[PDB]
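User: Hello! My lab partner asked me to get a predicted holo structure for this protein. The small molecule is calcium ion, SMILES included with the sequence. Please write out the structure tokens.
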Amino acid sequence: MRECISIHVGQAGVQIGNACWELYCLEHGIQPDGQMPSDKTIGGGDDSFNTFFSETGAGKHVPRAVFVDLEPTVIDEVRTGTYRQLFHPEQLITGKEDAANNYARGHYTIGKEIIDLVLDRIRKLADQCTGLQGFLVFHSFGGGTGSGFTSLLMERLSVDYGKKSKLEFSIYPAPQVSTAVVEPYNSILTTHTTLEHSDCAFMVDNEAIYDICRRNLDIERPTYTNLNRLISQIVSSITASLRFDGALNVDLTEFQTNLVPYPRIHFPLATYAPVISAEKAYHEQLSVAEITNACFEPANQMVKCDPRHGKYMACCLLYRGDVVPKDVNAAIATIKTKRSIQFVDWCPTGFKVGINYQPPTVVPGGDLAKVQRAVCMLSNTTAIAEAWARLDHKFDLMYAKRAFVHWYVGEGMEEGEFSEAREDMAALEKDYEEVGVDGEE
Amino acid sequence: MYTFVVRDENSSVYAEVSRLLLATGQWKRLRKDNPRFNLMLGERNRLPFGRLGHEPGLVQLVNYYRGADKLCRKASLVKLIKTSPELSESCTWFPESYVIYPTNLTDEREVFLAAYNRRREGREGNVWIAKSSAGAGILISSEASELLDFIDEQGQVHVIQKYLEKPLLLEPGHRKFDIRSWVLVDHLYNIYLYREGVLRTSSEPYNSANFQDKTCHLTNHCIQKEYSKNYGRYEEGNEMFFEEFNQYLMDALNTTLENSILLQIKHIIRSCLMCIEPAISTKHLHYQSFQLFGFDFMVDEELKVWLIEVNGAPACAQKLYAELCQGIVDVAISSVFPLAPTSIFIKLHHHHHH
Amino acid sequence: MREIVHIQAGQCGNQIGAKFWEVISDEHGIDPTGSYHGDSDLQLERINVYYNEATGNKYVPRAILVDLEPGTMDSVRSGPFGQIFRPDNFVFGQSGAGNNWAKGHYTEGAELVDSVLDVVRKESESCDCLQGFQLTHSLGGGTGSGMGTLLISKIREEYPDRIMNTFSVMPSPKVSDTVVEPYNATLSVHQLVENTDETYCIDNEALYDICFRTLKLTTPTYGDLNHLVSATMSGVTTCLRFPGQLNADLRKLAVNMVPFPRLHFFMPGFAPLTSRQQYRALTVPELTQQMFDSKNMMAACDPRHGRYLTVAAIFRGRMSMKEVDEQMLNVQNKNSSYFVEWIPNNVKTAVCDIPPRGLKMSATFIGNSTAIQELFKRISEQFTAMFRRKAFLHWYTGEGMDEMEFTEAESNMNDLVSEYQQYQDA
Amino acid sequence: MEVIELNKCTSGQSFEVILKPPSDPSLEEIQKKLEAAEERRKYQEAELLKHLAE
Ligand SMILES: C=C/C=C\[C@H](C)[C@H](OC(N)=O)[C@@H](C)[C@H](O)[C@@H](C)C/C(C)=C\[C@H](C)[C@@H](O)[C@@H](C)/C=C\[C@@H](O)C[C@@H]1OC(=O)[C@H](C)[C@@H](O)[C@H]1C
Ligand SMILES: Nc1nc2c(ncn2[C@@H]2O[C@H](COP(=O)(O)OP(=O)(O)OP(=O)(O)O)[C@@H](O)[C@H]2O)c(=O)[nH]1
Ligand SMILES: Nc1ncnc2c1ncn2[C@@H]1O[C@H](COP(=O)(O)OP(=O)(O)CP(=O)(O)O)[C@@H](O)[C@H]1O
Ligand SMILES: Nc1nc2c(ncn2[C@@H]2O[C@H](COP(=O)(O)OP(=O)(O)O)[C@@H](O)[C@H]2O)c(=O)[nH]1
Ligand SMILES: [Ca+2]
Ligand SMILES: [Ca+2]
Ligand SMILES: [Ca+2]
Ligand SMILES: [Mg+2]
Ligand SMILES: [Mg+2]
Ligand SMILES: [Mg+2]
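Assistant: Hello! Below are the structure tokens for the protein in complex with calcium ion.
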């Protein structure tokens, strides 16, 4: 068994974190007070769930997690909430005033003053680990803390934990729920400085989740609560391999090995099905073929884009529930004869498949219906570069006029960091194009 | 009030579509870089499809299908036909073709020579034609050596295609021609064949003993108006329209345009577009597409129809601009953005059971 | 707790400020004696942003009242909620400022300003995490304008890393006390250009025209104008005073609204504006259309004469957020040309469940529009018409000012006008 | 369509199907960056206070 430490940064990171740990407790049979009746080894153990939970002598199962935010009110929810007994104070870190949606404020001005405290608290967790794998880092692109402090933290983690893997779960900005006009700046600045420090990053576009919640959960105006419950379901599918018995993606290194042959191109697309409303009075249960076919619909992707007009480098299918290999292979055969699926020439056309027999857990009284079988597909497709193109275009529009730039320079950032970051993104877009792509008539 | 942007100033068809939209009084044109449009009349090259369909509260439509280039490039069309089971290497309405990369750059040179050699041995007609999308640029020859060498002198991909030695010749004049069909595919992937086509004719008598002089061999409107003395002699602008061509077919061959030719044209159009539908359909996509295509056909003396190529950004015949452009607005645009007959189109559909 | 420290200076500043505290005290369920009598926890959740908690569960406005004569603050103290203010936070002289920026800024105001800063420090010292300051004042008089901008400069020196926000009443010949108002306002605008992060521009002629034309008040009083302003101030600060995601504090608001440091002058607006049919239900579509109607805006500038750099819209009351989003998207999608295209998604919308007293719903508009240049052009024209003849200058040179300072103020405001124009053409 | 590396346990199973074969900054440097930005904030603030002193 090898430990993983989760790090939740800023409002989005923290609130998504609270949704995930809630779901993990429900999946593992851990009560709000930390007790876990099914765990017969009191006060210790090296089971798969111990990758995410340590144990006290009193039998408390404590998340290997640190929460960090530059303002106290979101993390005060956690101190005060249903699972408050789960965490001890040293795991929750708050400042007094936030980064004001300003990467420079998060990275340089405030980050400089809190980074050593955060590393100290992380060090305390690492000292409990017999064989630390690395880190799972949750944050928004758009917030000043999620963008700026995370990139600082990622740099320092590479220094203090050089051999350790670092995965990201990143919330890509959507104007339908966004709170700052400058989020394109923050996104590109943080991507630039974090790029070399992250081994694999799962981007979730709030636009996609928002529209899935509206369309499939019939929620007229989704809240962060609706959004995060769905995000936690996807995160859980992705990390289930680290927390349950299995032979696929059983450690962080395997995520890179299976999904990322090209280091800079480390952003797999997640696709998830089925998403069914709990208020739906009559629901016909979807087959293995139907939920698998749904993995190739943009409407079910965590980022809207068109994989038909890109190339695959890798594809992983992660099932939960009543699924056997026979039905997966029958579904895949059919899908290949009907769908556009081009792999790059230097990779095999194939799928790595994981099945966990335990169907998805749902939060009691939540939006999601219990289903007999579900699947998360992780594919490294060049199509996800569409999201970088979108972001880079908005960045260009504002930067050409230097709109809002004085806010960043005012915190000690040089204007040159803007163009440097944008140049790095230009190369990233070109990398995707090289991998992915070959009037008056 | 619906909104749209124009990003191809060079398009006659969509200049007229734009003109019409404004005339409805219910469409407003924005600056070409305003993202809050309902409708994009896109640029021909590197249209940013990746930025479409991400505008909260705006249904967005564009006048190109991402991926249609597979059909609309010479080399891409050859590859698409040979590798698609629904079309296949034994497809009967497309001339034997090969993709050849200049030796200064897979490549079917040896496969071409083998087929070429077989014909040369069996006394068969052996005139092939070299051409490429990078042209205005064409070479017709019965010698493989000339064909392959002409391509090396260039730096772009080429296609060597079997030259139809037995074309249908119009009389009087003993002259060659090709048929242009305009096809509109809407956002639901309804395939609409414009009822009016045009025959782009050669005003020079066809001569099989001289491929050196290409004016009697190439029916392109530009070439005829430039290098042909008899331009406009038989018909205005070397364009014969379907009514006259039908009357000719009745008079001369005791048949009809519909029977002898259009059945095959409709078959070919539907085969091509249904083949790539899965690759390009926007049915469940966050933005929608339509596109106007220009299919080019040749007819041989046995009244067999051959596909020559598909154009992704066609112009129209002057006399037909108004009708077709109104047709575009009615079926492609107002279908998505309704305003506050006897269609001009033939909906191509067929569901044979087996 | 992100505390805001409120300052109100001079006659206009104190009359509007008093009305403002009356209005938001009613919203938070605070009675005139500082006792809480509300029925919703939403009322207290962010109450500490504007109020301190005294002994006996009393809430006291974090407010400093400043004047160079005692009259208006006497009236405030004798007014409805006058006893709610901290007695030590009344800071005043006796000689007045005579509608004279120089008296406010350099002579009379100078003698008083340190005592004001002492009270400002006392309030700041007890803040757990001070956001910054909001000042209410007029630009056309002497105390609010001259001493108000002196205060702002000294506050910036002592608190350089805190946000400075003003509600600034711009003079108009149509609703005017003295002919020197354009002098006082031109002098003050240069101060605001350099030393505030956000300035809400309230034109007295706009207020008057709303009262006369739309509200059908035959003879509007300063009292009528001030209730409009108070309602607007309540709306624009809703995001600071109640739970919310968007523009929830002064700095995040500035980062969203101010793309260039000098262009931080906002046009506010309020809906509904209804004449005494007053019981008629208002719809979201109607709120939205009126909120964006030039007639509902308070800078007397035609929005169609310029472009929006950024817009914040706040809706209050129980309503469909789905419909709000739809209606806001409609306004932008149907008049997209009036929003600069080089700041994507530059219109932000907030919804708060608690509506103003006596309304089912309301909407407040904050626009950073280049059309605000018309306001400064008007002031500049009135300034020059007098200054070219050096008319009325002796009132100022008698306090030690020289003509060169007027020349520089003039140049500064014309520079500001030019800066707006370049982004209107961008 | 070859299945490979089939692994089974009580909690589930995993395998691979192939349809077709193929054809940092040091602590010191981070420090200097953070201190350089802090220095620039100090300079800008010093300049402001000078302006206000005048
Ligand atoms: C002159 C119009 C007075 C009232 C109107 C009928 C309207 O009242 C209702 N209930 O719809 C209000 C909202 C008007 O549209 C406003 C323009 C009135 C306005 C703010 C100012 C006038 C210039 C001024 O004469 C003032 C003394 C008159 C009435 C105020 O007591 C109305 C209340 O004032 C508020 O602060 C809240 C928004 C809310 O409680 C509001 C009902
Ligand atoms: N999915 C999801 N997105 C969120 C949540 N909270 C914030 N966001 C998104 O995150 C971006 C704003 O960043 P935040 O995480 O709120 O900012 P922060 O990291 O706290 O940084 P500062 O507040 O600027 O110090 C916007 O795009 C929001 O839509 C959440 O709970 N779930
Ligand atoms: N295989 C073939 N056999 C006989 N004639 C051919 C031929 N290929 C091309 N031609 C002649 O050459 C002309 C141009 O060919 P092609 O269509 O491939 O290039 P192009 O795109 O420049 C003209 P267009 O697309 O407008 O028809 C055709 O109109 C036809 O008359
Ligand atoms: N809206 C409003 N404007 C006022 C009020 N009192 C004065 N004014 C305006 O304020 C300016 C005069 O400044 P005033 O505040 O009286 O001078 P001060 O006491 O020296 O600050 C002129 O533009 C007046 O029109 C008021 O109560 N409400
Ligand atoms: Ca144990
Ligand atoms: Ca590393
Ligand atoms: Ca004195
Ligand atoms: Mg935050
Ligand atoms: Mg062509
Ligand atoms: Mg007065």
